[PDB]
Design a protein around this motif. Structure first.
Motif, short mmCIF file in Angstrom:
data_model
loop_
_atom_site.label_atom_id
_atom_site.label_comp_id
_atom_site.label_asym_id
_atom_site.label_seq_id
_atom_site.Cartn_x
_atom_site.Cartn_y
_atom_site.Cartn_z
N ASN A 12 -10.81 60.11 89.03
CA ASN A 12 -10.33 60.64 87.76
C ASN A 12 -10.33 62.15 87.77
OD1 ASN A 12 -9.45 60.34 85.04
ND2 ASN A 12 -11.53 60.58 84.24
N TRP A 28 -14.20 57.77 91.04
CA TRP A 28 -13.91 56.35 90.78
C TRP A 28 -13.32 55.69 92.01
CZ3 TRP A 28 -16.21 53.42 87.65
CH2 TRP A 28 -16.81 53.98 86.54
N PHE A 75 -9.18 66.40 80.21
CA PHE A 75 -9.60 66.09 81.56
C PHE A 75 -8.73 66.84 82.58
CE2 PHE A 75 -12.99 62.93 82.31
CZ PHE A 75 -13.37 63.39 83.56
N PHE A 88 -12.21 56.02 81.91
CA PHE A 88 -13.03 56.28 83.08
C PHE A 88 -14.37 56.91 82.72
CE2 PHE A 88 -9.66 56.10 86.68
CZ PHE A 88 -10.23 55.01 87.28
N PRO A 89 -14.45 58.01 81.98
CA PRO A 89 -15.78 58.56 81.68
C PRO A 89 -16.60 57.60 80.85
CG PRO A 89 -14.07 59.80 80.50
CD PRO A 89 -13.37 58.92 81.51
N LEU A 95 -18.56 55.34 83.17
CA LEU A 95 -19.56 55.92 84.09
C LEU A 95 -20.93 55.28 83.82
CD1 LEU A 95 -18.51 59.67 84.06
CD2 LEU A 95 -18.54 58.20 86.07
CL LIG Z 1 -14.76 59.98 84.78
#
Ligand SMILES: [Cl-]
Length: 292
Positions: free
Chosen positions: A38, A104, A165, A202-203, A206
């Motif tokens: 990512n 990732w 991001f 994605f975050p 985590l």
């Molecule tokens: Cl991420």
């Protein structure tokens, strides 16, 4: 550092959607499979692949919803990525591979290796995902940033509505300044705000402070595998690094079997953008002894 992407596009249809990938080099050996994370794409590998292509096939997919791949309206959970990448690998008929993984892409790669251990002949990794048992393990000056990312209100505002991001985190975690041409290559998949869903999920996936539990458990599992596996490992690290600081790289050198560590000099998270030539040259030098 090169800014172009001189790779012909390839596409494969899996699970109803086209995935774009780089595919260069000879077809009669063990391929090297490059997995971005990512918020990047195969573009991240553009200056590394040319070191490896002379000797080995290089395959670098754009994860579903990213890069030049199609952008279905998914949740883009880790589990979605697993389904698409598993299908990608089988669609290409890959048997044994060498993995080159980041972020990732490393969670995907280590998870695939754990499930397919006899098919992995080596793992080159950098700034990879491991559990962060508490927020204290997280780099201090990024705790506030990622805590805010990991919310349904503010995190969506920042990452989807404002593109934080891409415009923020990506250049912040490269030591050298990214150029505008490089930024435009990273921006291009995400020009439409709605298409930024993976960048936010994605975050939120985590493994930090025990959450989400499914990803903490799977990441714990692949790390337990990794700590017991004799597979050759090549770990690149930088200073100060980000999710693998120098002291952790040194612990991993001692704790992971058959592990060679390579100091790339200055780096944060996207090490490939600070020292691609050392990463590529060191992967190329390390591949031959994996064959037998
Ligand atoms: Cl991420």
């Amino acid at each position: 550092i090169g800014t172009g992407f001189p790779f012909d596009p390839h596409y494969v249809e899996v699970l109803g959607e086209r995935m774009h990938y780089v595919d260069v080099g000879p077809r009669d050996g063990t391929p090297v499979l490059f997995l971005h994370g990512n918020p990047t794409s195969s573009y991240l590998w553009r200056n590394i692949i040319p070191h490896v292509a002379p000797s080995h096939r290089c395959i670098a997919p754009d994860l579903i919803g990213m890069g030049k791949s199609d952008k279905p309206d998914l949740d883009y959970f880790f589990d979605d990525h697993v389904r698409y990448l598993d299908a990608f690998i089988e669609a290409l008929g890959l048997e044994e591979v060498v993995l080159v993984i980041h972020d990732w892409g490393s969670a995907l790669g280590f998870h695939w290796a754990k499930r397919n251990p006899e098919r992995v002949k080596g793992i080159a990794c950098m700034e990879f995902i491991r559990p962060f048992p508490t927020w204290d393990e997280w780099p201090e000056f990024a705790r506030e940033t990622f805590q805010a990312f990991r919310t349904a209100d503010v995190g969506r505002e920042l990452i989807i509505d404002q593109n934080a991001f891409i415009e923020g985190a990506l250049p912040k975690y490269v030591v050298r300044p990214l150029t505008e041409v490089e930024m435009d290559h990273y921006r291009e998949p995400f020009l439409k705000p709605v298409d930024r869903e993976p960048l936010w999920r994605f975050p939120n996936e985590l493994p930090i402070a025990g959450e989400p539990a499914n990803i903490v458990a799977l990441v714990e599992a692949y790390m337990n595998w990794l700590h017991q596996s004799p597979v050759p490992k090549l770990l690149f690290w930088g200073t100060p690094g980000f999710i693998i600081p120098p002291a952790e790289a040194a612990r991993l050198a001692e704790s992971l079997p058959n592990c060679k560590t390579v100091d790339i000099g200055p780096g944060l998270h996207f090490l490939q953008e600070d020292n691609p030539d050392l990463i590529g040259s060191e992967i190329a030098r390390w591949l031959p002894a994996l064959h037998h």
